[PDB]
């Protein structure tokens, strides 16, 4: 009748998962959508450094342990959605071009973004990531976890007892949490996928506290605004 937020998934059962890392430490999740591309949240780009050797780790389960299926690729460049009005909560989605192509196998595969499936409020969804299980933890969960969440109506999420228009939940955004409107994934959860009924529907927006009632998780819905954006960048790669 109390406490429950984050069940550990079977090792390598979410082959599409990627770990965005700076200096070898996880700061965000992400999804591999093409051999050389990873989709994640714009919040995951540390704009306060020219270096810190940013990389992506594929085929992993434990962040610290060595694993046969682990692949560490260097990030060639960050391409966050263009913005005229940045500020917290707004087009929090980013494409990460990998330095080289990832090797595909049972533990490392690509996940297709939604194409036309709509998302109703009340639907059951799973959020996958290394988010910490403790709200006061500076470190992420060592192992990949998954939290079940329910999609909330924009109407309820934009109400006064919730975000009260600030952040305002647009059509390109979506809220999901538990019966109490609470967000269960903590630090290191941003950039991961919101999956519902086997469909890749959205990216976890960064900068939102967990464990706080009426303050549900905010995800960046993969609408036509981004799909087009993603498609334009998928070329290049070219050919010869």
Curated annotation (Swiss-Prot):
Pfam families: Trypsin (PF00089)
GO CC list: extracellular space
GO molecular function: serine-type endopeptidase activity; serine-type peptidase activity
EC number: 3.4.21.-
Classification via SUPFAM superfamilies: Trypsin-like serine proteases (SSF50494)
InterPro entries attached to this UniProt entry: Peptidase_S1_PA (IPR009003), Peptidase_S1_PA_chymotrypsin (IPR043504), Peptidase_S1A (IPR001314), Trypsin_dom (IPR001254), TRYPSIN_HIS (IPR018114), TRYPSIN_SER (IPR033116)
Stretches of the chain forming a coiled coil according to its record: none
Proregion residues excised on maturation: 1-2
Subcellular location: Secreted; Cytoplasmic granule
PROSITE patterns membership: TRYPSIN_DOM, TRYPSIN_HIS, TRYPSIN_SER
Keyword Disulfide bond attributed: yes
S-S bridge residues: 28-44, 125-196, 157-175, 186-210
Domain of life of the source: Eukaryota
All copies of domain Peptidase S1, residue ranges: 3-235
One GO BP: protein maturation
Active site residues of this protein: 43 (charge relay system), 92 (charge relay system), 190 (charge relay system)
Annotated tissue distribution: Expressed in lung, spleen, thymus and peripheral blood leukocytes.
Keywords: Disulfide bond, Hydrolase, Protease, Secreted, Serine protease, Signal, Zymogen
Family statement: Belongs to the peptidase S1 family. Granzyme subfamily.
Protein name: Granzyme K
Species this protein is from: Homo sapiens
Taxonomic path: Eukaryota, Metazoa, Chordata, Craniata, Vertebrata
Gene: GZMK
